[PDB]
Structures are given as structure tokens and as C-alpha cells.
């Protein structure tokens, strides 16, 4: 049930857009430079330049979800943690949506924002409309269009440098990765514990005790090892409910911050909200 | 010797309990579904009656007319040197006899020639005085009992075993107590008529049985037939919905045996220890080391017998399969009443001041009466024990002082008040009671499966098999896994290696001293994709950890290709995208279009928005839309009576719950 | 789950009590008590987590009743896809339909 | 587990039906209510069990009649109080009684 | 029977409750208190001896 | 909950150690360790919820 | 090992009593035998004559 919920969480956040939009080929709308938040045709990478930095900041336990039998046998010298989990029956399943597919959804969302049912409108007349929702008069933007665009381009740059250096902003995404790894490695370490039996090694017990005596000790080990699995499952259920609440709130901001102008105080930023852009991150999203 | 198939034959009632409208799962000796069965045909042209092995029980069926097949003979050597049991229907009644029979090479009835003579008899039973018949039987031999099951079905098949399902019922439980490894059929001759019979073998398996509303077994599922069958046994249902399911990891069974013991050639010195001319006194007990030898101790069966024998950290039936390290023997003499004190946790003069065992003792204790050698009619007084001391002894310590004793220190000279000698003599006599007769005691101690060993039981070694799943036995440690050479370096006093899980992942070969690594045989995740049993029975299987361009797959029917999720077998690959009926993973999905098809998932409808710095679009029309949204609000409210769920209506069980604490108050507060 | 042995000789309390005396029976009965108490505790823990999920859904249903049914909402996609006009609630088993 | 012909010395009694009693059928003891049953036991069968492994059927040794066994305790109960300080009286609600 | 005894500050038993007397007494023993608050409580299922 | 027996003869550690030797006490103390660990785990799980 | 073996999960009882008065004689009784040489061990409740 938990595994199925994880796919549902991602779908409700990124799959709001029904119709996919092709990436504009100009990336410069009315003095605003939208290059660095859209895919670069020259660069092979499908994700954007800002999305490149985020993926590098988060260390991931496993790249590919395939671990062949030969590889674990050929590298017995290294005490690989993943081979250890696999040999005790613990598995990790791949997500339904690939990292490229999520990047496609975010590319279309930015394209639709920057070009718009579609109802296309220039990026200038649109920002003038936003100023009306704030409370300012439209003539303010037209008279001061040039400096507003310059401030917008410098602000995009100030964000670029912060991600280039080491930032604590992605700490929450890092935390989720570490919690999952620790729980799996705790189960492997709990196989060494005696649960009132003479020994924790099943091969030792069966070698020196007969059937009737062996059952007494084996029963103790079974009782203790079942409790370890039950505790792990209960912890996972509580963690999942927390992730689900975070996923629900993220989908709300996508509808209200990215697909419209929000008049709620501090919901889509500290100041007076104009608009928002989403960007994909490992096991998360950045606004 | 034609080969046939047993589709679903060979199900029988497991026990004597009555069940109805239920599903029951059990592990027992069953004939697996669709297993090979040999055919034996008896006609005027050919008369088949060879000796077939038993092999942990058989399934026997006969398609014939005119009553050709009559019975069976079960035995080991099938001659007059061993017991055999005969079950025959001689046209008048059923006769069962188990005797030393002089078996005939050609046993048959005439339209009788079974045996010549019979002596050393044990059991006897007599009963009251286009094929069209199928008769089915099951035989098994457990704990000296030969079980017999029986069933009947009318048929019309010409010359082959009909397919179908039929449940057998018990008819006999024979207390024969004979060793059975072979059997033969008894067929009558007329030439011969048209008849045939078939034989199958039983293996341990887990079956799921379906009881109808009258208590009849109408269907069964073999959990080991295929991945779909295993899914049903785990879910405990005969129907499965559409979707993808996670089954057990990929399993492998061993195909070999490896035994590795060190080179020893000398028998252990049983005679010099048990049969030595002289043993010491209990207070001055002696200890001896046991050098590399073979511990058979079956040679003792001829000469030496023990009145006491008790092992503590090991079972008595495992001594012949182990290797022992740091073996020592202790010898001394006590009187009969004192033998009970040679055990951990005892008190008394012997345990307090003479000889004490540790609480966590590992070894065996032996003793035997020796009144004929250690006792004289005049009286023997060479054996002594200590009865005065300041404090108690520590385990495996001795005191051989002879300093005079005075209570509360204050040394003394022997001829003085409150001055005593601390030792006493036993004084064994020929005519005294057994409680005062002498006994010789030997105590053996050792460790197991932790360090190099030089003493081992009688067993035969084998060659090493590497890069293959096998059963292994290294100096008494057994298991299943794969052996490969290792780069680890062991110090001379190290014999085994262990990991953080405490699994034994390394061992030094005793004969060649080569370090080896040990790894499990089962590895890799599996999952089953089905469109629903009601729709079809075919399924596709996804292997997450296989690269199919030595494949670790159960079977390759067809449609094998590599996806981003793994190696998929049993689905057609199409190039068009669809709405992801069933999510496989990594952007792959499956559907039932009639075969299972796998395709890449589509993200949505595609379009392009033209951008213009001078244009704008404004709607001129509108429509009214109504949509529905559904939300849960509340769930069911429940309560629990813990004294009824636990202990039912039992009173004494309820009393035990009260003494157990019974934290039921907090359970109900949470639910309330 | 009442049919499972928890290391004892049998899962039937009437079978143990019939052929084992008080001392021998007490050994087996304690094993069954421990396992059956553990079964109850697992059921209660799952119910608490399930109730937490329902409570969150109930709170959101109360928010939409106030904002979508008793007034006009400007939040995008909160009270339907298009531009919201009004809403009507209808009762359902263990839920509500808007 | 099955039919038995060797028994200890004990005096039998008459069957009592539709009433909670202490029973002992061929050495198996317990408490419950005995009523006639329609289940059809095969000759080699003596006892019957349900999914919970509770013993719920038995063939009478003397008359070979099939009898159903059910517990004696059943039904929900709750207590209403106004507070012991205010009053010592209470009311009782029986959920499963008409 | 099962009884709930009350020990005072000097070690003297001054009161008691018999859990088998009536439904209210059984409620007291389960919660282990001589005082009960207003409300409705769930008790053991109807018993027949 | 520290006063509850968990299948052991006594719930008081000092009582068991006073009259039983090392091996026979190791059986009873294990029963108390498992039970008291279960109490702690239940408390932690409730705190998380 | 060679004459009479009980199964691991044995249900029953074992009885023995001394019969030296009837089974023993001054000269010596040699009518009772037992096997001490065999290839392998016996299975439960199986005999070899
Ligand atoms: C080892 O020898 C010492 C030397 O005598 C023992 O110590 C004495 O123990 C007795 C008995 O408790 C006391 O009454 C003496 O006062 C001790 N003497 C000294 C000098 O300490 C010691 O008990 C012996 N160890 C054992 C296990 O018996
Ligand atoms: C049942 O009888 C068979 C045949 O007499 C026994 O098989 C023999 O076992 C010995 C000891 O291992 C071998 O040396 C022989 O070669 C075996 N005979 C054959 C024909 O293979 C079998 O051991 C007996 N079973 C029991 C439990 O005693
Ligand atoms: C000097 C040889 C001492 C024996 C070697 C030491 C350990 C051998 C391994 C296990 C103990 C074997 C018990 C031998 C007595 C058999 C008793 C019997 O006949 O039933
Ligand atoms: C937009 O930004 C990119 C990256 O900083 C820069 O290379 C490009 O020149 C900018 N646009 C224009 C029109 O200069
Ligand atoms: C078995 O038969 C042969 C052949 O007559 C005979 O020599 C032998 O003594 C018989 N064995 C026994 C045990 O009677
Ligand atoms: C069958 O065997 C029984 C018992 O040995 C015997 O009495 C009877 O005469 C036999 N019948 C035939 C036809 O051989
Ligand atoms: C077996 O038969 C022989 C004679 O052939 C006899 O001497 C011996 O006592 C018999 N043994 C048994 C156990 O009946
Ligand atoms: C059970 O038995 C009754 C009575 O003979 C019969 O009518 C019914 O068909 C049987 N049930 C099944 C499933 O055969
Ligand atoms: C058994 O002991 C007897 C008597 O000493 C002897 O004759 C016989 O040869 C021994 N057997 C073996 C196998 O050693
Ligand atoms: C045991 O024998 C093998 C071959 O017979 C030999 O290679 C090995 O060295 C021997 N063991 C020792 C310790 O010498
Ligand atoms: C599988 O093997 C092929 C050919 O060797 C290789 O191209 C491919 O990358 C492999 N896949 C994985 C997941 O290792
Ligand atoms: C919208 O289009 C429909 C289609 O015929 C038309 O009947 C209706 O009058 C239009 N609405 C307006 C406001 O023109
Ligand atoms: C036992 O005795 C009663 C009355 O004496 C009789 O009715 C019953 O049939 C007998 N049992 C059997 C199995 O016949
Ligand atoms: C306890 O004993 C003291 C000593 O006389 C007394 O004063 C007090 O009243 C006693 N407590 C009660 C509750 O009576």
C-alpha cells in the first residue's frame, strides 16, 4: 500500500497539466531572460541548467535498481551494503515515473506560464495584469519596464550562485534519503542478536542439537525476528503519512502559486506574490 | 517403459478431522501435479513384472478389465534373508501376510505361484469371504506403519491414464516394522489379458485443499507448480485480480555434497583411558589430553558398558558428525551414592571440596561400577576424599594439601583439641551394599565449531566443488551455499570468519589450508503480472536483477526482452503508447489486448503555443459544467473484550491472564 | 490468527487442558497468551494510523463546506476546475459528495 | 484426534441439550451449548473443527449422533452513569437483546 | 472472587470493592478507581455460567 | 507495568537472584527483559502517533 | 542404535521391572541375545531379525 501511494503522490503534483507544450525556441520575452529554467537544445541534457545543480547537491544511495548475482560475488572483498540487504531479502523497487519524464512535465509548465484553453498573451501585458492584482497601477510597469526586467535577471542569477556553492536548502531532501537507508541497515544488524537462545546462528544450532532440542531454540529466534520486521513496517507507515501531508501541500501550491496569483499572506513568498516557477528535484520539488 | 503425466491425481485426506466450506493448507508427501509416471503393460505379447524402487512412497494406479492386477509384495532384498509383506486378493478375500518368503522370480495367479515356503512369521490378517475400471492407491511407510489409501473411478480410456481429480480415503494402517525399499506387482495369467498399471513417486510439498459444504475435497492447488500457483497459496484464494504482485525471491536448490575433514588415521585411546590398571583418588584427580584420533566408540559396544551417560552442550545423536577441539579427560573414583554429585549446580562433600563442574559446562559424564577389581574381601582403603576445608573450590581446581585442620584458622598440631586430619578413607568391601560400592568416573570436556580441531568422528570426505550451490560440512559445520576462493588472510589460530550479521562467510579448508568464501544461493526479486484468473491463466514474469541481453530465470517460454525495469518474459512489445493500464515501473506498463503487451507510457496530448508580441485571444462563448468530488468522513467504531478473545470461556486460563498483567485497559482506552 | 501456534504444542486451549496438569499446562498457556496479546496490539496500532488519515480527510471536507458551499471561493482548483460559482452537498455512506 | 475404544474408568450421564454445561466427550472437556447438527461425518471421523481451530462438532459415542458445540457468552453490554459523586445508580444497555 | 483492596496511609485496609457484585463494581475494578466520571462505558460481554 | 509477571515466577529481580543460581535465573530474567522491552516500544509508538 | 529405537515425537509411556528371580539361574541363562554389529542405524519402530 505504501509503494502504490508514492506513485500517487508524484502524479498529483506534476501531472496537473493535461496538454503538453513544446519548449519555445527564443527564451527571451520582453526583456526577461527565461534561459537557465528551460531545456537547452544545444546541450544534450533534457533538464534545465538550474535543475542540473539541484540533482548534484543530493547524494543518492543507488543509481540503478539492478544488481546482478555475478557482481556481488565478484566483489566479495568490499563490504557492500546493498549486496548485504539483498542477501537477506530486502528489496527496493524503482519509481513508476522516470527522472526524465518529471523534467518533461516541469518544462511544459514553465512554457505554458511564459506563453499564456491556451489564450496566448505577450510577457509584458501579462506582468501588467499581475500588477493590478497587487494593487499597483499598470502604468507603473510600462514606464519602468527596463529596470524591472534587469532586477528580474539579476535575481535569477543570485539564485544560480547559491546552488553552485554548498547550501542547506536541500537538507530536507537529503534527510529523506538518509532515513530510508538507516532503517534498512538497522534490520541487517539485528540478525546478530540473541533473543534468549543459545546462539544467533541457525547453522550452528542445527549442527550440534537434535530435532527436539533445536525447535526450542529456533522458536525463540523466530519470535524475535518477526518483531524486528513488524517494528520496521510500523515506522514506515508513520513516515509515509508525514510524506503524504507534504505532498498534498505541494500540490496546493502548484495550483495556487504557479497556475494563478494568490492573495493569501505568505503562501507563495514573503512579499506580494506575482508568480512562481516549479523545478524538479530528487524525491521533491523546488518553487 | 513409456512416460505419461499425472495431471492432478494423488490427493488424499490428510487427517481424521472434519472440515467444511473452508480452505486448508498442509505440508506432507504428495504427488506433484503434472509429474512423470511410467507405464507397465501386461498382455499375451509382453508380461511386465520387474522390481521397482520405493523411494519414500509411491502412487499406484491400474487401468484394466477382467481383474488382472491382484496385489503387491514389499521388501528389501526380495529373498528369504529378509522380511517381506504380501497383500493379495485371491478371488475369495484379501489376505495380508508378512513373513520370510522364498520369493519366486515369476509371481502370478493361474486362471497359485507366489512363494515356496514361509517361516519366522510376524503379522497376519484375513478378510471376510477399452478399459472400464480405474483403481488408485497410495503407499507410505512412516514410523513402522504402512499406510494404504484407496479410490475408484469408472473410465472408458483405451490405453492411457485419464486426466482429472479424485480424492483417496484411508483403508489400512499396518504395524509391520519392516525395512521397505523395493516392491513388485502380482499379475495373473490366462498368455495374458489386456491390462496396465502406472507408478509415480511422492515428494514433500505444500498443498492447499478446498473442502466443499459436505466435507468433500473437490479441488487443490500445488504451491510449487509455477509462480501463479505460489501467489495463490500466499493469498490463500483460488482467484486473483488484475495487476502486478511481488512474489518470493529467486530460489535455487543444491546439486551436490561436500564433506571436508582433516587427515586422521589413528583410533582414539579408549582402552588406555577406560581400561587403565590404576585410577587416582577423587581429591587428587588427574587430567589427560587427547591427541588427534578418530572417536568411533562403537567398538565399546562389544566390551564396555556404562551405568551413567549424560551430555550437556550437545545432543547424543550428533556425536558421530562433529569435530572436537581442546579435548581433555579427568579420572577418579567415588562411591555409588556420590555419582549424582558429578553434575553442574550440585552440592555436597564431593562438589564442595573435591571436584566441581562449571555452570556452563560442555561435555559428557561417564561412570560404571567396578566392584570386582576395586574391592577386596578384606577391605580396600587406598581411596580418599576431603571433608574439611575453609571455603569451597572453584571449577576445575584441585587441592592436594594434607595440613591439619582446626575450625576458624588457628593452626594446630595433630594431637590436640579441635585438630583433625582433613582426609577420610572409603573402605570398599565385597559384601557391602551397592550404595557404598566403588565407581570409576570419566569426564570429557571440549569446545565446538569455534577453533581448529584434531579429533573427529568417523566420516568420509569428498572433493571440493566450487562455483555451484551445494550442501557442505566443514569440520562439523553444515549449510548450503556457493564456494569460491578468497583473498582474506587467516592467522594460524583462526579457522572461521564471520560478518556483522554473524553469518559464517569464510572457512579454511582442513586438508589444503585454502581460504574459501561462502555465499547464499537465493538472490533476486521477482513479480507476477496477470490479467485476472477469470480472464486467463497465462501470466508474465518480471526479473529485476537479470540482464537477458547463464540466465537466472525459472523458464523461458517466449517473448523475452530487456526493459528498464528488468527482464520480462511472456509479453509482446508494441511501439505505440497508451494509458498505462498496469504500472510495471521505470516508464513501462502492461495491458491485455489476446495476449499481454508491454509498452512505454504516454505523458499526454501534445501541442504548440504560438507566441506573438502583438496578438491576444479572447473567448466569445461559455458553458456551464458540473463535477463531483467524493471524500471519506468517518470509519467504523469497534470494541474488544480481551478476556473473550484470549482464554474464551476457560476459567484457569482467565486466572493466568490476571497474573500476566493483562494490559487490556490501555488497549480499550485507545479504541474508545 | 487464533489458529496459529506460538511455540506451544497446540492452538486449542481445551486440548492442552485435557491431557496436561497444572504445571505443564501453565507453560504452554503462557505462550499462547503472549502471542494473542501481540495480535491485539498490532490491530490497535493499525487502527490509530488509519484514523489519522480519515481525520485529515474530514478536516478538508469541513473546509470545503464553509468555503465552497456557503460562499464563493477564489482559490484556484479548490472547488472544481473552472471558475467556481456554487456547490451542493449530498450525503453518502461514510462520506459526502460535492 | 480419532475414534477410541480404550477408555479410563468413568461414569457416563444423559445428554443435556439447549443449556450451558460442562461436557467431556471421549476425554475432551469444555463448556458450551449442545444442539443437534446436520453435518455428515464419514466413518473414520470423530471431531470437527472450524477455521479458528475451535472444536465445534462431535459424534456421540453411544448413539453416534452429530452434535454442534457453541460457547455460552455472547452479546455487548455498556453502562451509563451520572457520576458516583452525584448518584450511585446506573443504567445498562444491551445491544443484542430485543 | 476478585477483590480490590484500599490501603490507607498507616497501612490499614479501610475499604474494598467486589468486582462481581454488579456492573458498576466491575467498571471500578477494570479502571482501578473508586471514583467514576459521568459518561457511558463499555464493559465485558454478557456472561453465562 | 513493572509489577507484571511476563511468564516468570516473580517480577522482582532481587527475589529471583536471591534463591536461584546463574543458569536457572537466566531463564527467568530473559522473560522479564522481553516483556519490559515490549512496554518501552509501545510507549514510543504512541508518542510518534 | 541397532535393536530398538523410539521416534523423536513419541507419545506413550515406558515401564520396566526387575525379574531376576524368573529370568536368571545359578548355572547361567543364555537364551537372550542382542545385535552389536550392523551397517547403519535403525529407523524408529523397525526391527531386524
Ligand atoms: C587460594 O589460597 C588462598 C591462601 O590461603 C586462600 O585464601 C584463604 O581463604 C580462606 C577461606 O576463605 C580464608 O579463611 C583465609 O584467610 C585466606 N587466606 C588469605 C591469605 O587470604 C583462598 O581461599 C584460596 N582460593 C580458593 C578458591 O580456595
Ligand atoms: C534397508 O535395507 C537395505 C538393503 O538391505 C539397506 O541398504 C543397504 O545399506 C548398507 C549400509 O549403508 C549398504 O552398505 C548397502 O549397500 C545397502 N544395500 C543396497 C542394496 O543398496 C538399508 O540400509 C536398510 N535400511 C535400514 C534403515 O536399515
Ligand atoms: C580417550 C578417548 C576419549 C573419547 C574422545 C573424546 C571425545 C569423543 C566425542 C564424544 C564423546 C564420545 C562418548 C564415548 C562414550 C560412548 C558411551 C556409549 O558407549 O554409549
Ligand atoms: C540569457 O542568459 C544567458 C545565461 O546567463 C546568457 O548567455 C544570454 O546571453 C542571456 N540573454 C541575452 C539576450 O544575452
Ligand atoms: C534360503 O533359501 C536357501 C535355498 O534353499 C537356503 O539354503 C537358505 O538356508 C535359506 N535361508 C534361511 C534363512 O532359511
Ligand atoms: C484365499 O485365501 C484364504 C486364506 O488363506 C483361503 O481360506 C481361501 O481358500 C483362498 N481362496 C482361494 C480361491 O485360493
Ligand atoms: C529363524 O529361523 C531359524 C531357522 O530357519 C531359527 O533357528 C531362528 O530361531 C528363527 N528366528 C526367529 C527370530 O524366528
Ligand atoms: C451435498 O449433499 C447433498 C445431499 O446429498 C447434495 O444434494 C448436494 O449436491 C451436495 N453438495 C455438493 C457440492 O455436491
Ligand atoms: C567381541 O568380543 C568377543 C569376546 O572377546 C570376541 O571374541 C570378538 O572377536 C569381538 N568382536 C569384534 C568385532 O571385535
Ligand atoms: C591431507 O591429505 C592431502 C592429500 O591426501 C594432502 O594434500 C594434505 O596435505 C594432507 N593434510 C596435511 C595436513 O598434510
Ligand atoms: C545488459 O547487457 C548489455 C550488453 O552487454 C548492456 O549493453 C547493458 O547495458 C546491460 N544492462 C545493464 C542494466 O547492465
Ligand atoms: C455560445 O454558443 C452557443 C452555440 O450555439 C450559442 O447558442 C450561444 O448564444 C453563445 N453564447 C453567447 C453569449 O453568444
Ligand atoms: C451403547 O449402549 C446403549 C444402551 O445400552 C445403546 O443404545 C448403544 O447402541 C450402545 N452403543 C452402540 C455403539 O451400539
Ligand atoms: C494514622 O495514625 C495516626 C497516629 O495516631 C493517626 O493520627 C491518623 O489519624 C491515622 N490515619 C488515619 C487515616 O486514621
Author numbering:
A (entry chain C): 751 to 866, 874 to 1044
B (entry chain A): 30 to 140, 150 to 167, 178 to 238, 246 to 604, 618 to 661, 672 to 750
C (entry chain A): 947 to 1044
D (entry chain B): 505 to 602
E (entry chain B): 260 to 308
F (entry chain B): 947 to 995
G (entry chain B): 407 to 455
Wording from the paper:
The trimeric spike (S) glycoprotein decorates the surface of coronaviruses and mediates entry into host cells. S receptor binding domain (RBD) comprises a free fatty acid (FFA)–binding pocket. FFA binding stabilizes a locked S conformation, interfering with virus infectivity. In the prefusion conformation, the RBDs in the S trimer can alternate between closed (“down”) and open (“up”) conformations.
To elucidate LA binding by SARS-CoV that emerged 2002, we determined the S cryo-EM structure. We analyze SARS-CoV S by cryogenic electron microscopy (cryo-EM) showing that LA-bound SARS-CoV S adopts a hitherto elusive locked structure sharing characteristics with LA-bound locked SARS-CoV-2 S, incompatible with ACE2 receptor binding. Locked SARS-CoV S is stabilized by LA occupying a bipartite binding site composed of two adjacent RBDs in the trimer. One RBD contributes a “greasy tube” lined by mostly phenylalanines accommodating the hydrocarbon tail of LA, and an adjacent RBD coordinates the polar headgroup of LA via residues R395 and Q396. The overlay of the RBDs from one chain in the open conformation with RBDs in the locked conformation illustrates rearrangements of Y352 and Y356 at the pocket entrance and a 5-Å movement of the gating helix to accommodate LA in the pocket. LA binding to S also induces a profound conformational change in the loop comprising residue R620, which then engages in a cation-π interaction with Y819. Residue Y819 is part of the fusion peptide proximal region of the neighboring S subunit. This conformational rearrangement is completed by a π-π interaction of F305 and Y622 in the locked conformation. In the open conformation, this symmetry of the R1021 residue arrangement is broken, resulting in a destabilization of S. Together, LA-bound SARS-CoV S adopts a more stable, locked conformation incompatible with ACE2 binding, while the open conformation lacks LA and, as a consequence, is more flexible.
